[PDB]
């Protein structure tokens, strides 16, 4: 689900669940313009600024994983079995070939 | 150059005061606070450059330079 | 319902303004100190989706993303305020202005404004005014017995009066300069009046630092240039084809969809 | 569902969106100093389906548009305050809130106090202050903007009209009423004398036109409806086939 | 809106120009002391579609590319400063030039 | 989106390029000095398909396949360098080219461009200089007290002083001849400036190595033939209704395919 919304303290939350970026959970400067790239930089427009400011704040944790290694949990969200937990690690290395 | 677009993110422009002790003597310490002046969203880990601390009378008092402890 | 529809009937409109423009200069050739108006337009805001100049890749920027325009939207009419050729009208009370200045009258509510036409007329009692009966400062008073009335270049009124070889001076003709001469207000009936962006109205002698000069006899027509306006016609009614052409166009797209 | 009328949907979006171009540059025909638009579309991501080799489409989606800086035919307004570009340079206007716009609309005013404003009213940069007694308003090739004074027989120098160029031209950011603002990808804006350093010259008396060609809106509005009705079918024959699935 | 109309446009204006500079000395026939005047023509934009002399190849040069150019502009009206004929109206005030000076 | 009308676009395009060259060989028929355009154009693409000269039945081969050929480009804009007819306007200061030659100016900028028109005047200074205030090079100084300009047809000029039965020489004016005079890149302002399709500027004086003879007095008029202009508008206008016919039928066969 990319349908991405911004709340009034800024943070990027999908469907209630904070998005996790490189630096962790993303929080985005508050009442900002949002630009997401093709490799899941974000970057944040101040109204009434100059296009002149637009400046990075995150990049995007876009993981890659075959229908073989991951599972549904009860919750919805996809996790990676326990064989490809133990073959991949627990946290997924976040692949640069990811476009988006 | 003086034409040019200087975008920073990791500078803050700061006020610092602090309170000249009694019978205070040169090469002596003393604490100060510092607090950010426009549009900063944090000092977390940042570091106080050289700073010449004025008194009433427009005269550098103290020099203040050091790492800021933030509470988190 | 639909974008293209918008855009298109901003421009239509834009277009009808145009073509009244026009219509208005075309109406007036005859008329006396009348200047010809020229609309300017704007488009109108811009949609932004795709920020330019945001990341395109961690490494790259996009160059130059996508903004959808709307549609246009007129700014302002400016008056082409230059010297409308003059004309001998052959009459000792009409009055032309060679340069830049304006002849002030007194409306009937007690304001003061200002007109270019010289068409200059005598109530009864003696007082030049204008053709709509608006007394012309600084209210030259002309008496009864009158021979011939003199408006030199300077503007001196003067009335030689029978059996005395000297003229007898009845006022003085004075000209009133804008800072910005197209920001007058135009009430119509030739008449402008001073608005905060027509600056102040500085009042000058007729021949000094840059007011005109007062020639007796003539009037000053309108500088319409005519051919011009044939041709911006021809221009006005192919881009109001093509505007109707794009309406008529997506009124066939949605036709499919509502097929569908 | 899984099917193709979101690659038809994405389809048309891109015909309006097209359409929507096309529309603003026939409406901004009379706008004087106007840079045509065209939208480039650039397909979606593909998904590849494994054997024991071919890829399957989703549609098409608009990426940028890019405006066309060519240089646009100059008209008459032999007005002494219009002045036009030839060659590639832009007014710098400052806008009431400090920051500095560009413009190429050449059709200026001056204000209540002197100043030389654009029809918006904005100042122009450098800013000029024309006296109150001009007789006439010279501006040169190269900018210098001279005032006649009755009596005195040279005229006197008010300004120089500096001309800011970008490197890239397409990048600035359009605001809205014929200004533009510098970005990152239209950064370093080198303000010059226009005549040098790739600077354009002035023409006075002139204003520069609006770069929009007719033929190619047209044509192009005959293919965005043709297509959008290819695309309409396309969506009216999935919904035939979802139908006839649905009433087994 | 199409460039064509804009080059006839201002070409209209020279020919205007022209008929009002022919009808300004036709009607200052009889005055003297006249200067009649002349109106200069020049070449407006050219539109550089193709650059002449672009290198189109490692070895061959593009001639005279695509210039299209758009209309005239009148340069200036000058008036031509010539000794007008001499006429005789036998009066002590009247006095003519031979030359090329000025009364103040 | 469909082939047929992407070649109807570039023929209506041409014809319009063909038109603009055709306005603007017109607007400039007053321009002295001026030079009359002509467009060429070439094919675009020819899809292979069937490949002409491939084997067919082992011993025989296949002619002519099916090349199925796009639109058409205009190759380039070639500017007809004639004589043009010389006019008689009785000045000292107007100079004709009868040969292949040009005039030598200084931009202020620094580089040097070339010049054909030969109306020139002289600034406050007495330098011979062109009617837009560009400087003629070598550089022609005229006295301040000068009775008479003499510019022979050897580009030698003279100035008769007072008091001086003998005219002296004040300068020398050459012409630029090129290998291709086409190659010249016209900036506008009767100005052209060297590329490198053009060669190099080789200085002549008048009436050696093929430099023209300069005739004072006189001015070049404009080579534009009138008629031919009608003519080609003629055309100019048949050839656009007729691709405008194609792209109408091409929208027909389109619409009756979506129809259905």
Redesign the interface.
């Known amino acids: 689900n990319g349908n991405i919304q911004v709340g009034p303290t800024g943070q990027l939350t999908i469907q209630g669940h904070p998005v996790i970026g490189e630096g962790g959970p993303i929080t985005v ?1 508050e009442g900002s313009e949002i630009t997401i790239a093709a490799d899941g930089t974000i970057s944040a427009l101040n109204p009434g600024d100059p296009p ?2 637009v ?1 990075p704040v995150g990049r995007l944790k876009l993981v890659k994983a075959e229908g073989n290694e991951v599972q549904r949990s009860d919750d919805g969200l996809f996790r990676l079995t326990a064989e490809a937990q133990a073959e991949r690690g627990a946290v997924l290395a976040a692949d640069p070939s990811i476009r988006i | 150059p003086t ?1 040019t ?1 200087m ?1 920073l ?1 990791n500078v803050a422009a700061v006020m610092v005061t602090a309170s000249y002790p009694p019978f205070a003597r040169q090469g002596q310490t003393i604490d100060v606070v510092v607090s950010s002046m426009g549009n900063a ?1 944090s000092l977390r880990g940042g570091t106080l450059l050289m700073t010449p601390l004025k008194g009433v009378d427009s005269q550098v008092y103290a020099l203040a330079q050091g790492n800021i402890l933030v509470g988190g | 319902m639909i974008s293209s529809l918008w855009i298109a009937k901003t421009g239509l409109d834009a277009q009808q303004t145009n073509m009244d423009v026009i219509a208005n200069n075309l109406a007036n050739v005859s008329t006396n100190g009348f200047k010809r108006q020229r609309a300017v337009f704007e488009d109108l805001l811009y949609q932004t989706i795709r920020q330019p100049g945001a990341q395109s890749s961690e490494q790259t920027t996009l160059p130059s993303g996508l903004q959808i325009g709307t549609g246009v939207r007129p700014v302002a009419t400016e008056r082409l305020h230059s010297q409308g050729n003059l004309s001998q009208t052959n009459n000792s009370k009409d009055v032309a202005i060679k340069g830049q200045g304006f002849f002030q009258v007194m409306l009937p509510d007690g304001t003061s404004a200002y007109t270019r036409d010289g068409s200059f007329q005598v109530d009864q009692n003696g007082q030049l005014v204008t053709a709509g009966g608006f007394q012309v400062q600084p209210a030259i008073t002309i008496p009864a017995n009158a021979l011939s009335i003199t408006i030199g270049r300077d503007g001196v009124v003067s009335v030689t009066q029978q059996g005395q070889a000297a003229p007898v001076q009845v006022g003085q003709l004075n000209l009133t300069t804008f800072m910005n001469d197209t920001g007058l207000e135009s009430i119509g009936e030739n008449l402008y009046i001073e608005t905060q962006s027509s600056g102040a109205p500085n009042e000058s002698t007729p021949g000094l630092n840059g007011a005109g000069l007062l020639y007796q006899g003539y009037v000053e027509t309108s500088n319409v240039n005519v051919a011009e306006e044939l041709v911006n016609m021809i221009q006005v009614q192919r881009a109001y084809e093509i505007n109707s052409k794009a309406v008529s166009t997506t009124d066939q797209m949605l036709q499919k969809l509502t097929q569908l």
């Open positions: 400067p002149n400011t400046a | 034409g677009n975008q993110k969203k």
